[PDB]
């Protein structure tokens, strides 16, 4: 008799990609599809002047 | 007792907690909330933008 | 013109708190409400057998 601990995953797949880029003033962006279990996110300050 | 695709073998409580992959947290069914998730993706910004 | 940067909460309503516990070995605990990301959960290993 056994009982389950973790699972992991050895093969990913990723779905749609959203963006939500704010300009230099107002800083951080949001992207409502964040704040879920199922969406991964990272902020990367980016080139975009004029 | 570790199960990849349709195979099985034993490994230590040290090796099995330390693998850096998404966690299932021993969860059941539904839409499992995946811990981590970051280690398996690849966020790269081309030159400065996009 | 201005612009908003972050925000900070002064006052926290706390409702629900529905709990999940498991056996000494059928891994650590979990429940559906963590994927909600609007909740807060801290899995602490404290309880007893029998």
């Amino acid at each position, epitope marked *: 008799n056994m009982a389950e601990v973790r699972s992991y995953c050895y093969e990913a797949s990723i779905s749609d990609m959203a*963006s*939500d*880029s*704010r300009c230099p003033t107002q800083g951080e*962006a949001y992207l409502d599809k964040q704040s879920d279990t199922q969406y991964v996110c990272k902020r990367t300050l980016v080139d975009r002047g004029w | 007792y570790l199960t990849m695709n349709n195979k099985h073998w034993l490994v230590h409580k040290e090796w099995f907690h330390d693998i850096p992959l998404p966690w299932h947290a021993g969860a059941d069914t539904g839409t499992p909330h995946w811990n981590n998730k970051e280690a398996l993706v690849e966020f790269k910004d*081309a030159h400065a*933008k996009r | *013109n201005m*612009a908003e940067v972050r925000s900070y909460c002064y006052e926290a309503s706390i409702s629900d708190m529905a709990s999940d516990s498991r056996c000494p070995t059928q891994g650590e605990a979990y429940l559906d409400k963590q994927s909600d990301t609007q909740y807060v959960c801290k899995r602490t290993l404290v309880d007893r057998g029998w």
Partner: antibody
Amino acid sequence: EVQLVESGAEVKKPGASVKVSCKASGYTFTSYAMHWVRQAPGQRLEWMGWINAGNGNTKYSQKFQDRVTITRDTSASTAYMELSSLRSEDTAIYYCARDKVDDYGDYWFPTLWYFDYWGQGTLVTVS
Amino acid sequence: SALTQPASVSGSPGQSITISCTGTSSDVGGFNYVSWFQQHPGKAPKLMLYDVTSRPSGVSSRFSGSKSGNTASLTISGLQAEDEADYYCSSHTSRGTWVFGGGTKLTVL
């Protein structure tokens, strides 16, 4: 000059699938990109577009997120929007317009102008 | 999420009118992305502004754009009789999609 032309469709009953063509003329394909802006008469324009004709990439409005799919064909210099599972409401006219890609060929941030030209329209009606 | 644009307007020739397009910080405020599309009804729309203040080459020079906060103002002066094109304001949101305002039917007298 810059010329956009489209196919004048018919109703294709509720639940059918429209396929409208945008064959770009009078400018350089390879820098065209493409949009789809639906309108029927009497309400606000919705933009249900896609944005990349070099690589064939696409971005859709969240409303239409999965309904339309888009094929580009450079041999015919033509972009084909196809709206599957249309309904009574989507009786409208679909314009295709351009906003030129940045030269890298990747389209992320548009030109400061967007639409300097427009398809001439295709009114599509549902029974 | 359509931008707020008021339904319609009129007045004497030469007289300046103001069309107010109010967005949110998500689009109109934190970007200079705006454009006002003159759409002759039954004909294809055209773009009478770009980059706000700027204008395409074939624009009648008496169109003027402006912005402060969340606003888009198309201010026209000495309206020549045939200037009724349904004016729609449109901008690039932060999420990477474009939204067209409710549109302003323009009423000449």
